[PDB]
């Protein structure tokens with residue numbers, strides 16, 4: 045019931061009690077660990093509501109006060125009457141900050157309490173969604189001095205009037221299969237791009253075409269919009285030592301903004317809740333650039349560095365990887381766009397874990413996602429035992445809308 | 452039930468049925484994953500089903516399930532258990548058992564090799580000197596002048612828990628660590644406590660940065676005894692770099708034979724508390740962990756100093772740069788001296804092939820992603836992208852408490 049986690053580099057042992065407040069299921073059993081798997085009515089709603097208001101009122105030191113009991117009554121009244129209920133602005137902000145706080149795959153949670161919440165629950169159309177999103181984009185980007193933000197569209201009702209951003213992130217690049225057989229641009233977005241084209245988008249068929257937004261309001265058929273090019277801050281990639289690096293013609297965008305997740309607060313479901321912070325360097329330079337099913341540039345880069353690519357044991361892939369990652373960090377820092385390196389981010393997360401342990405009784409963390417995709421063991425998180433469990437409010441995966449939508 | 456795992460790089464999907472045969476616990480529950488936790492005297496009653504399960508597995512593997520030889524062996528084992536409270540494995544079963552413990556070892560990336568294991572039967576051993584002799588022969592055999600061969604040596608099983616055979620060393624070959632009065636450490640900080648025990652037992656310490664530790668060997672529950680492995684049997688590799696000529700002046704070397712000696716081998720309910728085994732190194736074990744962990748030799752600074760990297764900010768990736776150069780050095784050195792070693796690309800790629808074959812032929816391959824993914828360059832290896840299922844099959848290798856914590860000293 046009381047659980048210990050040990051850091052094997054420092055011997056510091058922490059005690060976790062927060063896991064006893066765990067709501068949802070992990071995917072694991074006593075027989076099988078699924079730690080590495082990517083994706084493992086009125087009566088339902090009141091305990092969920094209660095559980096949430098209880099933690100809310102506890103957080104503002106007013107547990108069992110008049111205002112607390114009155115609110116539970118009011119919400120109780122409203123559920124019984126309307127089958128759903130509405131959050132106060134205060135609850136909405138608390139809920140969103142806590143969904144981030146509870147995100148076990150997020151290394152950047154030291155920042156959790158500095159989140160700008162944009163309430164877009166008064167939104168009714170796709171043009172309105174586009175407006176809200178442009179405003180979020182400009183606010184978060186802040187001319188390169190990035191600020192964390194979330195924009196929250198209206199909650200699910202009967203489930204046939206869902207708000208959804210069909211895009212996986214607000215800003216991503218198009219993917220195109222060619223007669224050649226190869227892939228131009230980002231192979232991860234080939235399918236979404238096809239959906240855009242069949243919906244009407246004139247694709248310029250280039251390597252780094254910022255995708256348009258495909259926005260769905262009120263369960264209606266989704267609609268296309270180009271984000272003002274002037275609002276999409278992009279960074280050309282160069283190297284502080286390699287003159288040739290720029291000739292690869294690589295760029296990335298400054299704003300990482302996940303737009304396909306579902307925010308659950310007090311049982312209510314917010315199916316459109318795009319949020320953004322800022323990049324850790326490895327996300328772009330290791331994953332986006334070097335994954336075999338992504339831009340897959342290691343082969344080209346190693347060539348230009350004239351490494352011996354005959355045998356895997358020369359560590360040529362490893363050498364190029366480091367340089368590509370040096371260039372990403374340098375390019376962002378030179379253009380004054382917020383970015384964090386994996387050493388600094390993981391050092392912060394360890395400090396955050398210690399704060400959460402002493403102030404909250406723990407910190408759900410998924411080691412598989414928290415450890416950076418390069419240089420794992422030279423970052424402190426590699427050596428830190430973590431317990432993974434699901435707390436609410438939460439960000440959840442949800443099915444991609446094209447498989448769900450009834451046109 | 453059928454469980455699917457996906458590779459997110461290739462979209463190849465595999466189906467696991469093998470997990471249905473898993474008995475032991477993971478530490479995880481429906482409410483908590485303990486997948487990153489390092490560490491999450493049997494009755495007659497508990498012993499017979501364990502023996503039965505094992506013997507059924509053994510007889511199935513040789514295509515003799517339900518045969519007269521199978522049934523006679525169950526009855527013979529049953530009788531032996533009721534009469535003596537334990538039983539003895541036939542040589543054939545011991546070999547099968549030891550190979551399957553390796554096959555089942557979910558944290559081992561080298562399992563493509565599982566069917567090629569030389570098993571040395573040391574169950575006739577009675578004394579610490581006997582153990583020393585067995586271990587010397589294991590080292591010489593496995594080393595093979597640099598052309599490493601996988602091996603395990605199996606000492607007598609647990610009886611009453613008061614007569615255990617144990618190798619107190621965590622690996623047969625390791626370097627001493629010494630805590631200085633000024634709080635710094637000479638040698639390997641991981642081995643300070645064990646080095647202190649050795650000294651107290653009467654080892655005369657040379658007190659340098661790479662002193663091969665003596666063996667501390669416990670036979671039949673007696674107090675352990677010290678022995679020095681003959682130096683001519685300990686193959687070592689001076690570390691140098693293919694392009695950086697100052698690298699040799701760091702004074703680094705490592706030993707060629709990685710030989711885990713502190714684990715417990717479970718076969719058919721029987722417990723083999725001393726079962727040292729060895730394969731060969733994957734380069735990152737030495738170049739990433741042994742050299743660059745902060746709590747190990749911790750050489751990152753000195754290497755980066757010598758490379759003249761910008762060290763004023765982490766975001767130069769200086770640590771990452773030094774790290775790669777050190778790992779190139781380790782692979783180059785071992786290759787140049789004709790000592791078996793495998794790089795993390797080759798080893799992970801082979802593991803994925805192994806894993807896919809096991810799914811097809813066996814119905815699964817339990818694997819601990821946290822341990823399988825190498826400690827540098829994670830996602831440019833195919834294992835990072837492979838979903839895995841972790842579960843516990845027997846025969847198995849298990850952790851056991853350190854013997855200095857449990858031993859009853861006789862004096």
Ligand code: HEM
Pocket residue numbers: 144147149150151152153155159192193194302319320321322323324327384389413439
């Ligand atoms: C402030 C800067 C932030 C940093 C440096 C950061 C860091 C990261 C990183 C590196 C990942 C892994 C991404 C991947 O591999 O695909 C991640 C995942 C995640 N983060 Fe953050 N984060 C930040 C802000 C935020 C914010 C503002 C939120 C929500 C308000 C958030 C919630 C999440 C969630 C839910 C995931 C998992 C997403 C998934 O499963 O795909 N993070 N974080």
Ligand code: HEM
Pocket residue numbers: 549553556558559560561562564568601602603711714728729730731732733736793798822848
């Ligand atoms: C043949 C070459 C082999 C290679 C390249 C290899 C590779 C590895 C590596 C890199 C690890 C992780 C080590 C660490 O981080 O401490 C490991 C773990 C392990 N391997 Fe192997 N292995 C090999 C042979 C063997 C053999 C012969 C056995 C036993 C018969 C074995 C059983 C295990 C076990 C039980 C672990 C887990 C150790 C622990 O939990 O501390 N392996 N393997």
Ligand SMILES: C[C@H](O)[C@H](O)[C@H]1CNc2nc(N)[nH]c(=O)c2N1
Pocket residue numbers: 079080081082412413414459835836837838839
């Ligand atoms: C199969 C495995 O779970 C998968 O590759 C994970 C591993 N760790 C990860 N870690 C992060 N941060 N992001 C990812 O997409 C992944 N992918």
Ligand SMILES: C[C@H](O)[C@H](O)[C@H]1CNc2nc(N)[nH]c(=O)c2N1
Pocket residue numbers: 052426427428429430486487488489821822823
């Ligand atoms: C806390 C964490 O489980 C621990 O540091 C693990 C991570 N993965 C590992 N993987 C291997 N191969 N060896 C290790 O010692 C570790 N250490």
Ligand SMILES: CN(CCC[C@H](N)C(=O)O)C(=N)NO
Pocket residue numbers: 300301302319320321322323324327328331332
């Ligand atoms: C969640 N993450 C954004 C994910 C972006 C993605 N990994 C990418 O590398 O493009 C993040 N840094 N939060 O803002």
Ligand SMILES: CN(CCC[C@H](N)C(=O)O)C(=N)NO
Pocket residue numbers: 622709710711728729730731732733736737740741
């Ligand atoms: C288990 N592993 C050996 C472990 C050795 C350890 N990583 C070391 O570097 O000393 C191995 N390759 N087996 O042969």
Ligand SMILES: [Zn+2]
Pocket residue numbers: 072076077078079479483484485486
């Ligand atoms: Zn688990």
